[PDB]
Nucleic acid binder design. Structure first.
Ligand SMILES: [Mg+2]
Ligand SMILES: [Mg+2]
Ligand SMILES: [Mg+2]
Ligand SMILES: [Mg+2]
Ligand SMILES: [Mg+2]
Ligand SMILES: [Mg+2]
Ligand SMILES: [Mg+2]
Ligand SMILES: [Mg+2]
Ligand SMILES: [Mg+2]
Ligand SMILES: [Mg+2]
Ligand SMILES: [Mg+2]
Ligand SMILES: [Mg+2]
Ligand SMILES: [Mg+2]
Ligand SMILES: [Mg+2]
Ligand SMILES: [Mg+2]
Ligand SMILES: [Mg+2]
Ligand SMILES: [Mg+2]
Ligand SMILES: [Mg+2]
Ligand SMILES: [Mg+2]
Ligand SMILES: [Mg+2]
Ligand SMILES: [Mg+2]
Ligand SMILES: [Mg+2]
Ligand SMILES: [Mg+2]
Ligand SMILES: [Mg+2]
Ligand SMILES: [Mg+2]
Ligand SMILES: [Mg+2]
Ligand SMILES: [Mg+2]
Ligand SMILES: [Mg+2]
Ligand SMILES: [Mg+2]
Ligand SMILES: [Mg+2]
Ligand SMILES: [Mg+2]
Ligand SMILES: [Mg+2]
Ligand SMILES: [Mg+2]
Ligand SMILES: [Mg+2]
Ligand SMILES: [Mg+2]
Lengths: 206, 51
RNA sequence: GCCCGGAUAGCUCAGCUGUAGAGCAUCAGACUUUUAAUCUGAGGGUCCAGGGUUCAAGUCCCUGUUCGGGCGCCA
RNA sequence: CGCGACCUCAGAUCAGACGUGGCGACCCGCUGAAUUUAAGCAUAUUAGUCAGCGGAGGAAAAGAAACUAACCAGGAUUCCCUCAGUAACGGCGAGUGAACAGGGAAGAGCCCAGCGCCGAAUCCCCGCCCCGCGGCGGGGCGCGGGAAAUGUGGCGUACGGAAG
RNA sequence: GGCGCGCCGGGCCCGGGUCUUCCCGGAGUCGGGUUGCUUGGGAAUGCAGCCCAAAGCGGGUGGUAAACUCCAUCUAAGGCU
RNA sequence: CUAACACGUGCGCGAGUCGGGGGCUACGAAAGCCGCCGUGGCGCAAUGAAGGUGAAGGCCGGCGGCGCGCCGCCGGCCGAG
RNA sequence: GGUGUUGACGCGAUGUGAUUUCUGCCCAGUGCUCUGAAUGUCAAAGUGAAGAAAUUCAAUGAAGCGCGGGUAAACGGCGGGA
RNA sequence: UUGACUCUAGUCUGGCACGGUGAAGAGACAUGAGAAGUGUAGAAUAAGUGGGAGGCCGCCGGUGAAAUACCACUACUCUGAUCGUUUUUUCACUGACCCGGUGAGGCGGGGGGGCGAGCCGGGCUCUCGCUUCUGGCGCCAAGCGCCCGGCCGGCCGGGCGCGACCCGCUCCGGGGACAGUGCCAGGUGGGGAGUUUGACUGGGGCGGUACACCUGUCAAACGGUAACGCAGGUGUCCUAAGGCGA
C-alpha cells in the first residue's frame, strides 16, 4: 500500500484521540485479515521479527540466568532465577503459570534448558510463552530490549490476526516506519504477497 | 469486462478474476497489471465509502 | 493411472472431543422333551496403518497400502 | 410569422484549375492456375510462376531501426562476392531453402502531430501601380473578399527539447 | 547550359558552453484467440477476415509453448530523401 | 549449351592455393597491377544427437605403498613403432 | 434475379400414357417424412475444479446419427417339401 | 455412375458481434439490519484472535480450565428478511433492422359538434362526423369579415383570415432485438471437383496364389536349378510343451 494512507490515518488517529481522551495506558494495535490462505493445510507460518522500536513499553520482564547474572540482575531490576528457584517453581506448575500470567515473556539462560524440559518445559510450553535464549555477550542491557518487540506473526486456524504495535506518545514518522516494518515483514512472510491480505487495520484500543 | 472483473474482485475471487482478464485482454502480464490496478481502484472506492 | 468414494467385533450400517451405538451371528442361563423355535442378557474393536492442527480426532487436514465405481488404452 | 447567424446539403454552359486514355522492356499492389516432378496420386513440386486486373517513373520500390546481436559489440535503404545448397522446411519422399557476421559499390540525412510559448504572428483569391514575363513571379496600396481557433505559421521531434 | 564576377530590390537580425526550473509522444491500434493463405521460419515468419481488445519504470524484440526473476536492445500503430 | 558431381589426363604453384567480386592504369568489353583488397572458398582435423573433447612412448636417480615389484610425484637421458 | 403484370381452377417437381375394364399383397431393406421424451453418442463457444501457467479434467449438451410411428400410382419385391 | 478415396459451392443446427428499453417468475450472490454460537470442569450457554487496567456508578486478583469476562474492531460458520450485481424464462415497448402501400394526402391526441343510457338547463363514459334505385356532373371558392391603393359618396384593381379547428417527434401500416448479415464450429452433400480402380497368368476375365515362408520330390549321387509340376504345411500353440537333475 502507499505510505500517504499511513500518514493521514496516523495523524488522524493522533487528533482522533479526541474520541475518548482515554483513561488507560494508551497504546494502539494493528489488525490483519487474510484473503484466501488455507489455515488447515501445510506451510502454516510463524515468523518473529526483530522490531527495533519497542511499542509496548509497559512491559513485564522476568528471566532465567546463569551466574555472573546475580549482581547485574539485582542491580538493574531484573529477576535472577536460580536453579533452586527453578526447582521451586517446578514443584507446582500452577504457581508459575500464575507467574506466566503475571508477566509478559521470559528470557532463557545458556545451559539450563535441560533443567527446563524435565517436567516444567512441557508444563509451560503450553502457554506460547517460551523464554528467549541469551548470547555470549552476557550483557542483558539492550539484549532484553532486542528480545522484547520480536513480534510473533502467527498462523492459527482463524483467518485473523492483530499485532500490538503503536502507542500514542512515540515519535510519528517513526510510528509510520514501525507500522511499515510490521506490514512489509507480514507480506514478505506470507507465501503470496499483497493480494493475500484483505484489510489491514490500525485502529486503537478503542 | 472490467466492471465484471471488479464484481469478481469485490467478491474476492482473484483466480477467476485473473483468468477472466487473461482471456479478455491477452497475456498474463497484462492480466496481472490490470487486475492490480482494478484492485487499487476498488480499494480507493472502499476508502471513499469509509471516510 | 484419475479427481472421486470407502474402511469401523466374525457380517451389514449409525456417529465434531472419549462408557464407540442399531441390528445379524456366537457364548451361557430360563423355557422347553431337547439352545429346534423363544427369551434373558453378557463376551467380542489396539475405529485399515501412520503423521499433523486441536484441549484431546474414530470424525478435520495430509501421507500409505487395499478394494467398489465411470473415463484412459486396446478392436 | 418574418429577419439574421451557424451547421448539414443541393443546383450552376458560374471564375480558375485538375483526373480519364496509351505504350507497358525494367517497377509497385492484388489475383493467380494447371501442365510438370513425385517413375501412380491426393500433401508437396511446378509456384506467388503463366494468364487476369489496377498503378507509376526515368528509374520504381525501399530507407533513416518498436534492427542485428550476445561480442572488446555493430548501426538507414539498395546492389555484388561470400555466408550456403548451410540453419531449416518437406507423404523428412521427390524436392525446397533464407538471414546474421565479414569484404566491397555507394553513402546524406531529416520533418510533422502531440507537450508547449508567441494579440493567427499564417494561407488563398480579387482590383489597381511599377518591373519581368514561352516554368505568371517580385515589390507597393486597398474600412477588398475568403480560409483558419473544430488550429495556420515561427521555435521544437527522442540524436532529447524549451524558457530564464 | 553551368562554373567564374559586379550592381540593384527584398528576406533573416540568427550562435555556443554551463547552471536552475519545466515538458516529452501516434488506439478498434498493440496484443491474445480462432480461421485461411504465404514463408526455410519449425507449439504458428509474414498478411488478412471475425471475436476479445489494452498499457505507461509502459510496449515490442531476445528463432521451443508457459510461469517466476534478472539483463540486453530498440521506441510501433505519422511523413519526406 | 549452362549448372552440379565423379574419375582419368595435361599445365602452374605447392601446405598451401585462387582474385572469379571490387579497385588502380582502333584492336582494348582485352591486357597489366593490387597484397594491410585472402574478405572468402576449398585444403591443412576428426568425432558426437549434443554438452563437448580433439590424434608415440620408454629408461635412469631421488622422495606386495603394502602380503600407488608396480610404481604417484619431481630433475636428466633416449627420443616418433 | 426468374416463376411473378403470379396466389392453390396457380406456380414448381415427378411418374404413367387416349377411351373401356381394373390397379392385388408386402413398411423386412433402401429412401422420404413425422415426434423429441428412456439409456446412448455428439462440435466450437460457455461453466466449474486442479496447478506457478501453458495445459489437464469433470459437468451440461444444438441439429445429425441412434431409437420410434407413417408411406409402395416411392425404389423394389411377391417360395419350397411330403 | 455409385455403397470408391479425399474434398467442395448449397442447405440445416449451435456460438460470438450488430443488439437496445422495460415489467414480472425462478435462482445464485454482494450488502445493511437481527439472533445463534449448550462435551465437560468452571456462579456460567467460553466459537475464535489480539490489545486491556478502571468504562459505568463486571472486573485487575483468586477459583476450575487447554483457553476468560469492561471496551472495540475486528475475521469464521449458521438462520429469516430489506436492498443492487449477474444469469435465466415469459410477457410486452420502438429505436437499429426487414416487408408492403403512395404523386409518401388528412396519423395520434385535444377541442368544437349530432344521435342513443339514466340519474336532478347540468357533467361524465361510449359511439358517430355527413356520398347507396339510376353507365350524369364535380378542380382552378362562392359567401362573410378586416386592412389597402389609383381617378372624381361613385368607379376600377388589390392583400389577409374564416370557409378548410388546434397541437405534435418518427409518411402511413405490418413485423422486431428474432428474421438477417459478417465470422467460426458440427452435420449433410456425385449437385459439382480432383483422382484411383495391384501383380502373376499357355490371350485377357472369372478361378487360384505358383506374391512372404516350410517339408519330401522334381533335381540327372557336392551345392544350385524351372513351369498355374507333384503330395502337403504356415500367419499358430506353450509358466511348461522353456532350463536343469533323478
Ligand atoms: Mg466554369
Ligand atoms: Mg506423376
Ligand atoms: Mg511418368
Ligand atoms: Mg499420371
Ligand atoms: Mg505457391
Ligand atoms: Mg502476369
Ligand atoms: Mg492508367
Ligand atoms: Mg513518362
Ligand atoms: Mg522513390
Ligand atoms: Mg543490416
Ligand atoms: Mg562450401
Ligand atoms: Mg516416407
Ligand atoms: Mg517454394
Ligand atoms: Mg552482412
Ligand atoms: Mg569504397
Ligand atoms: Mg515544423
Ligand atoms: Mg501548431
Ligand atoms: Mg527516431
Ligand atoms: Mg492464395
Ligand atoms: Mg497471397
Ligand atoms: Mg506452400
Ligand atoms: Mg517517427
Ligand atoms: Mg518510421
Ligand atoms: Mg517513400
Ligand atoms: Mg560416375
Ligand atoms: Mg586427376
Ligand atoms: Mg409413378
Ligand atoms: Mg401395384
Ligand atoms: Mg420403411
Ligand atoms: Mg431391377
Ligand atoms: Mg464415400
Ligand atoms: Mg455428394
Ligand atoms: Mg465423378
Ligand atoms: Mg494386369
Ligand atoms: Mg549332378
Amino acid at each position: 500500500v502507499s505510505r500517504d494512507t499511513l500518514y493521514e490515518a496516523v495523524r488522524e488517529v493522533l487528533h482522533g484521540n479526541q474520541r475518548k481522551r482515554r483513561k488507560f495506558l494508551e497504546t494502539v494495535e494493528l489488525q490483519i485479515s487474510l484473503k484466501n490462505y488455507d489455515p488447515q493445510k501445510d506451510k502454516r507460518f510463524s515468523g518473529t521479527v526483530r522490531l527495533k522500536s519497542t511499542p509496548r513499553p509497559k512491559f513485564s520482564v522476568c528471566v532465567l540466568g546463569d551466574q555472573q547474572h546475580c549482581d547485574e540482575a539485582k542491580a538493574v531490576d531484573i529477576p535472577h532465577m536460580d536453579i533452586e528457584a527453578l526447582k521451586k517453581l517446578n514443584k507446582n506448575k500452577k504457581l508459575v503459570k500464575k507467574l506466566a500470567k503475571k508477566y509478559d515473556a521470559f528470557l532463557a539462560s545458556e545451559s539450563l534448558i535441560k533443567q527446563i524440559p524435565r517436567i516444567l518445559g512441557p508444563g509451560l510450553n503450553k502457554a506460547g510463552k517460551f523464554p528467549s535464549l541469551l548470547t555470549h555477550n552476557e550483557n542483558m542491557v539492550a539484549k532484553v530490549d532486542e528480545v522484547k518487540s520480536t513480534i510473533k506473526f502467527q498462523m492459527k486456524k482463524v483467518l485473523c490476526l492483530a499485532v500490538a504495535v503503536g502507542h500514542v506518545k512515540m515519535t510519528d514518522d517513526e510510528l509510520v516506519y514501525n507500522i511499515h516494518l510490521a506490514v512489509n515483514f507480514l507480506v514478505s512472510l506470507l507465501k503470496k504477497n499483497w493480494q493475500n491480505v484483505r484489510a489491514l487495520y490500525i485502529k486503537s484500543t478503542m | 469486462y472490467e466492471r465484471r472483473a471488479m464484481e469478481l474482485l469485490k467478491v474476492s475471487k482473484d483466480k477467476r478474476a485473473l483468468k477472466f482478464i487473461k482471456k479478455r485482454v491477452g497475456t498474463h502480464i497484462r492480466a496481472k497489471r490490470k487486475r492490480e490496478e482494478l484492485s487499487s481502484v476498488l480499494a480507493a472506492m472502499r476508502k471513499a465509502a469509509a471516510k
